Structure formats: structure tokens, C-alpha cells
């Protein structure tokens, strides 16, 4: 299914704490829509972490 | 037999146009992903 | 010395559109198997 892989990318790869859920972070779901489309690059989880960080930064720009 | 309503065809054009945008973007994205990951 | 009529002539071209879609799908598959056959080690 998709629950196993989704929980993989959110927990084993992203290591994000559980208390930040899907509905509490919409850009997280938007990124997870495209994150699962690639099966590689799961060894340097810091890359996914950094992308999530700068996408959060992009979201909060008033411009 | 009578003239078909065109709003269904309107929704169809929008679906097809969005899918063509997706086709171009996805083909380019796949080839660029392969270029960065496997071709270095 | 009005739209339902012309839409059929449009479909006459959309058939060739389908044929070109088939040809491009065949081209892509041919490229993929060719690349797999040659370049991969």
C-alpha cells in the first residue's frame, strides 16, 4: 500500500517527531506528494530535511 | 440527435491541457533526475 | 450562383492524431530497450 512507504519517508528518513502531523503542516503533505515519487536518495536524509526546511522558508515569504 | 453540450468538452480540454503540461514537465524531470543521480 | 458537421471533419484529423500518438509511444519504447541493450553494464 502507501501507508508503509509514507510512514517510511516521514519517520525513518525524515526523523520528524510524531507530534507534527499531516494536517498541522500542509507544505509537508505537498512535499510528500513528490517525495515518494523518487525511491533513491534515502541515505542522505539531510537532503530531504534541507529541502523541507527551505520549502517551509519559501512558504512564509510575504513576496 | 442534437448538438452536444460543449461544457463537457471544456472540462476535457482542461484535463488534456493539464496532462500535457504534466507530460512535458514529468519527462524533463525524470531525465534531469537520472542525469543528476545516476550520471555523475 | 452548424458545428456538428465540422466536428466530424475534426475527428477525421484526430484519427491521425491517434496514429501519431502510437508512433511516438513506439519510438519511446524502442529508445528505452535500445538504451538498456547497449549502455547498461
Amino acid at each position: 500500500k502507501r501507508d508503509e512507504k509514507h510512514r517510511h519517508v516521514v519517520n525513518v528518513v525524515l526523523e520528524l517527531p510524531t507530534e507534527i502531523s499531516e494536517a498541522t503542516h500542509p507544505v509537508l503533505a505537498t512535499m510528500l506528494s513528490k517525495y515518494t515519487r523518487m525511491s533513491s536518495l534515502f541515505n542522505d536524509k539531510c537532503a530531504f530535511k534541507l529541502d523541507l526546511l527551505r520549502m517551509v522558508a519559501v512558504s512564509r515569504t510575504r513576496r | 440527435v442534437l448538438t452536444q453540450n460543449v461544457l463537457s468538452a471544456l472540462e476535457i480540454l482542461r484535463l488534456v491541457r493539464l496532462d500535457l503540461r504534466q507530460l512535458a514537465q514529468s519527462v524533463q524531470d525524470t531525465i534531469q533526475h537520472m542525469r543528476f543521480l545516476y550520471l555523475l | 450562383s452548424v458545428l456538428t458537421q465540422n466536428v466530424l471533419s475534426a475527428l477525421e484529423i484526430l484519427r491521425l492524431v491517434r496514429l501519431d500518438l502510437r508512433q511516438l509511444a513506439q519510438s519511446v519504447q524502442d529508445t528505452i530497450q535500445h538504451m538498456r541493450f547497449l549502455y547498461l553494464l
Binding site: 536518495l41 527551505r54 519559501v58 | 542525469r35 555523475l40 | -
Partner: protein, 49 residues
């Protein structure tokens, strides 16, 4: 890395959306990611100075 950079190896980065593989390629060398800007001769001379 070794060879001269053909204009195909230089690829501009876009900061707005995604770019996950670009972040993954950070350590790598061969594709020289650049901003889509080119310094003019006057500011080139200013940098040199």
C-alpha cells in the same frame, strides 16, 4: 573535475520549488550549478580590484 565544462554541464539552479536532487548532489562536482546571472565587465573589474 578533469575536463572543461561544456555549456551542457552548467545548469542553473531555481530556488523557488523542490530541487531535492540538487541538494542531494551538493557534494558532487561535475555539474556546476550556477545562479542564472552573469557578472558584467565593470563589476568583474570591481571584483578583481
Amino acid at each position: 573535475d578533469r575536463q572543461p565544462l561544456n555549456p551542457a554541464n552548467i545548469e542553473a539552479r531555481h530556488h523557488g520549488v523542490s530541487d531535492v536532487p540538487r541538494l542531494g548532489a551538493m557534494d558532487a562536482d561535475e555539474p556546476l550549478f550556477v545562479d542564472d546571472y552573469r557578472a558584467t565587465d565593470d563589476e568583474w573589474t570591481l571584483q578583481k580590484v
